[model samples]
Target: EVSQDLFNQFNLFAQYSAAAYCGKNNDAPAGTNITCTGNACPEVEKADATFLYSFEDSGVGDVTGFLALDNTNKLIVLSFRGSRSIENWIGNLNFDLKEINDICSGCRGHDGFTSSWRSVADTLRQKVEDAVREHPDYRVVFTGHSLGGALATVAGADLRGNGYDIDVFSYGAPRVGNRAFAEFLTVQTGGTLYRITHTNDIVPRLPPREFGYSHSSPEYWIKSGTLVPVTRNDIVKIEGIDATGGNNQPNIPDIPAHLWYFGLIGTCL
Candidate 1:
């Protein structure tokens, strides 16, 4: 499992690297005063571009937030896996950023987990290839919130190896591999290997933290807001409009249960 030593090492590295390049790269603007009301929420504006979509909890196992970009027939989807009950319980109840970060840092349980993230990448690449067989302008991108983010990163790299333009955007993802891998991901994807982690999010800076992994402020070029440091866990806030409102939710679209793609604003969730 994970320990403080490993977490601290990677955390420090991420922090230092990020400090070095505060605003040299990344041009995505941060939409402020997000009000999840009507179709006018900033989530829609920020994510409804030519390259962004946030996936809410699919009610699947261990998965939470996910995102996908439809640059092509290639649909890159990712989901966080591991300690769902713990993450949610704490997130919903305590809402502590530091404590949440601490929880993430301590997440070291890797029992029977699949490590062939490369395989997922391969499958996605092939799918993208098939989708773009007739139209060569398709690109596949995938991402997840936490553990899903790690999977997405590895998968995106594998797809890139096959000469495909794959991008990944992870939220609160832990440091999965070595510093070399993380650095390579940033440089390889033109920093498209975006990670959206809360300040002091312990999950992303976990494991094998040998001194070069940490999702600190500067490392995350497209930051959502200032990282409000908190001592206790009760200060964290879960933001975002719940898609399943009691009576105000949009009409649920009729679609297959397992299908991955759907129309924009399609109530397939």
Candidate 2:
């Protein structure tokens, strides 16, 4: 378990982890600087971070994800690039719900969740396990934005099924599964999920609850402050999962909120 300050710090890094996949040159050699072009960079020195594995699936909507470890921070981070193509958005549209077996007795998940991202996630699992085995002292954290968030949820759930304790921090993420699945994830992570949401980020309201989709809780809500040229210092943090309507509707999308997190700690491409 990490403190709020530490959690915020890591959350920004996780966003960078996802941001690292932003454009064409997504791959990074081990021990390279994860440069930030025009925004805030990660607080910790990420020069020591080493890219371990990457998963790509052009078949089911051009999905991409990667895993990296920062021995200096004793952290194993998994990040997925959010929707970037028409096919990817199409993948996000297949919101038919389904259930999970063997992993959780009565847990249900988004059909699109499994169909679009599971295979990639499954392929990465063994490699992740191997990495963890080599570095048993590291803690795991998973993150993504938009479509990638759904993949992160699937990956996190799968990792939990395989008995790996993890922390998940999703920005502007949609509901990845049903109520049971949410509960399962909460129990598995011991409620370590920090589902961050910026006010009215529309992406988080997708696969609407009306379709039997639900999000895991303990949300870290952010409200923009009344300052010029907003920076990290110009945001108010609201605690608790249910404080901001308890994952209910009327949570319309706020595009800027989805794209920029922590007043510009990083942007999800």
Candidate 3:
């Protein structure tokens, strides 16, 4: 059963995922007013968020992400934008598994994702920690869409190792690790991770199981195209990877389905 409270929570995180796209080609930096301009801005602005830090690596990772303090919800959010470069997408094909035992034992992850996380890990942690010291009451969330979702998943795993209790909200994220890695995350997070998948969205199926990849538990799959006035039955909650259980198959694989989660996702515009 999908609770109204659950829908409201992750739905807001989706907006932050979209908002991260505006990080590049914009002027919102640390200690300045946030300039995340777009349709999602309305919902994002509602949080009355205080901008912390925004980072973009145009090289190997080609990633864009930001951290913000949501005053209204009392949340500390670290959000990453989805793919934006041919370079980054090209990098995905070189998915060699990397040992991340520092994060968790028997945990290995996508090399590219781990590299991306490594690029921003130290700085991101400082920004999040700094925010917490000033206001310890706020909860923390690591979120993103598609590639960003995968990136945040990597970030969330690492942050949890640093002794912070946090939650992850990923929209249409792909498999970031193998079976052991996936299992370790689910157990470590203690059901705080919300890996939201859309019906027939091909991104989540990628870096396929044949390549030794698998997903974590409690996957929230939206069964319909539009979730307007959605009920409990509309969203299927699967505890583990459902091989035949779909939204996994498609008439001819739906790409557009990945873009709509409550509203247009992964895109700032």
- Candidate number of the best lDDT: 3
Backbone clashes, candidate 2: 2
lDDT of 2 at 146: 68
Best by TM-score: 3
Report the error of model 1 at residue 201, Å: 2.1
Per-residue lDDT of candidate 1, residues 192-215 (tens digit): 565544433344434423433322
Stretches off by above 4 angstroms in model 2 are 1-4, 29-33, 44-47, 85-92, 161-163, 225-252, 263-269
Per-model C-alpha lDDT, please? 0.34, 0.62, 0.75
Candidate 1 similarity to native, TM-score: 0.43
In candidate 1, which residue ranges exceed 4 Å CA deviation?
Answer: 1-83, 86-122, 189-191, 208-218, 221-269
Which 10-residue window of candidate 2 scores lowest in summed lDDT?
225-234
Each prediction's RMSD to truth: 16.9, 3.9, 2.7
Report how far residue 137 has shifted in candidate 3, in Å.
0.5
For 26-93, candidate 3 gives per-residue lDDT tens digits of 33656554445556556677766767877676335776777887788888888888876423453467
Candidate 3 local Cα displacement, residue 65, angstroms: 1.3
Better of 1 and 2 by TM-score: 2
Q: Rank candidates, lDDT, best first.
A: 3, 2, 1
What residue pairs clash in candidate 2, if any at all?
202-253, 202-254
